[PDB]
């Protein structure tokens, strides 16, 4: 039936719904940090969340997504392996059911408890749904989440989950700084995949950083609360939202440090 994380519809299921499931490009990937070629020609990311415009939160059935006005260049990251400017529409996180997974990518098999997707598009495909059908179409910032103290500026967003506990749900949530999540080292790892997610097209560009950030334990609980049910449906708990690792087949993972 429609795809999801469950036993009959997740992601070993997905391939039949959609075959680029089985792709070559295909996301997310254990980075193994020591087969990671270290690239000095790659330039330092460069995150310009200033003007950054957050319009609402929204459980979607398979995560929360808060999403930004992407209509002008508010907030946008360049640099890195990047060619051209591509805008921040969305940013949603995957989480397990326990603090030792959760996260898509690994880092030497490694899971963390959470990973924050920054979701851009290419401003040169002109809209989202353009992007999406180009090689070089989106770069999702992928921020791993490790289990310690509080990340006060995520605390907003998890505030407001309360309003949106079921599927279908959004609440309004402005002015949210997006910068409050990033960590402290912009230094990242860099390779060719798609989407976690059907339809798992292979347009990203995935900067991985290095560093994680730490959130606390009662502020992933509070992800672990949502639900993937609409409301007055049977309730299902909102945990383990991620995509296993998959092949990295033809690929070189390129690392902007030493
Ligand atoms: C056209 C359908 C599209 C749906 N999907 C996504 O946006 C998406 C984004 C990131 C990732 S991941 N896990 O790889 O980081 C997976 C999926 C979608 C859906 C609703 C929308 N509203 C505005 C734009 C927009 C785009
Ligand atoms: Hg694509
Ligand atoms: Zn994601």
């Given at each position: 039936?429609?795809?999801?994380?469950?036993?009959?519809?997740?992601?070993?299921?997905?391939?039949?719904?959609?075959?680029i499931a089985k792709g070559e490009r295909q996301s997310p990937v254990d980075i193994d940090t020591?087969?990671?070629?270290?690239?000095?020609?790659?330039?330092?990311?460069?995150?310009?969340?200033?003007?950054?415009?957050?319009?609402?939160?929204?459980?979607?059935?398979?995560?929360?997504?808060?999403?930004?006005?992407?209509?002008?260049?508010?907030?946008?990251?360049?640099?890195?392996?990047?060619?051209?400017?591509?805008?921040?529409?969305?940013?949603?996180?995957?989480?397990?059911?326990?603090?030792?997974?959760?996260?898509?990518?690994?880092?030497?098999?490694?899971?963390?408890?959470?990973?924050?997707?920054?979701?851009?598009?290419?401003?040169?495909?002109?809209?989202?749904?353009?992007?999406?059908?180009?090689?070089?179409?989106?770069?999702?910032?992928?921020?791993?989440?490790k289990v310690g103290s509080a990340k006060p500026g995520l605390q907003k967003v998890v505030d407001?989950?309360?309003?949106?506990?079921?599927?279908?749900?959004?609440?309004?949530?402005?002015?949210?700084?997006?910068?409050?999540?990033?960590?402290?080292?912009?230094?990242?790892?860099?390779?060719?995949?798609?989407?976690?997610?059907?339809?798992?097209?292979?347009?990203?560009?995935?900067?991985?950083?290095?560093?994680?950030?730490?959130?606390?334990?009662?502020?992933?609980?509070?992800?672990?609360?949502?639900?993937?049910?609409?409301?007055?449906?049977?309730?299902?708990?909102?945990?383990?939202?991620?995509?296993?690792?998959?092949?990295?087949?033809?690929?070189?993972?390129?690392?902007?440090?030493?």
């Open positions: 039936h429609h795809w999801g994380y469950g036993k009959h519809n997740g992601p070993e299921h997905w391939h039949k719904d959609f075959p020591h087969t990671a070629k270290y690239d000095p020609s790659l330039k330092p990311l460069s995150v310009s969340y200033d003007q950054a415009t957050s319009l609402r939160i929204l459980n979607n059935g398979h995560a929360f997504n808060v999403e930004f006005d992407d209509s002008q260049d508010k907030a946008v990251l360049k640099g890195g392996p990047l060619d051209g400017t591509y805008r921040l529409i969305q940013f949603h996180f995957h989480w397990g059911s326990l603090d030792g997974q959760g996260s898509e990518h690994t880092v030497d098999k490694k899971k963390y408890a959470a990973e924050l997707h920054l979701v851009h598009w290419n401003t040169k495909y002109g809209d989202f749904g353009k992007a999406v059908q180009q090689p070089d179409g989106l770069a999702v910032l992928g921020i791993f989440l407001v989950l309360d309003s949106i506990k079921t599927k279908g749900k959004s609440a309004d949530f402005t002015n949210f700084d997006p910068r409050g999540l990033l960590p402290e080292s912009l230094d990242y790892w860099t390779y060719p995949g798609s989407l976690t997610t059907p339809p798992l097209l292979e347009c990203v560009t995935w900067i991985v950083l290095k560093e994680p950030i730490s959130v606390s334990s009662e502020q992933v609980l509070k992800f672990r609360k949502l639900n993937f049910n609409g409301e007055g449906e049977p309730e299902e708990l909102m945990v383990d939202n991620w995509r296993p690792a998959q092949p990295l087949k033809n690929r070189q993972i390129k690392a902007s440090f030493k």
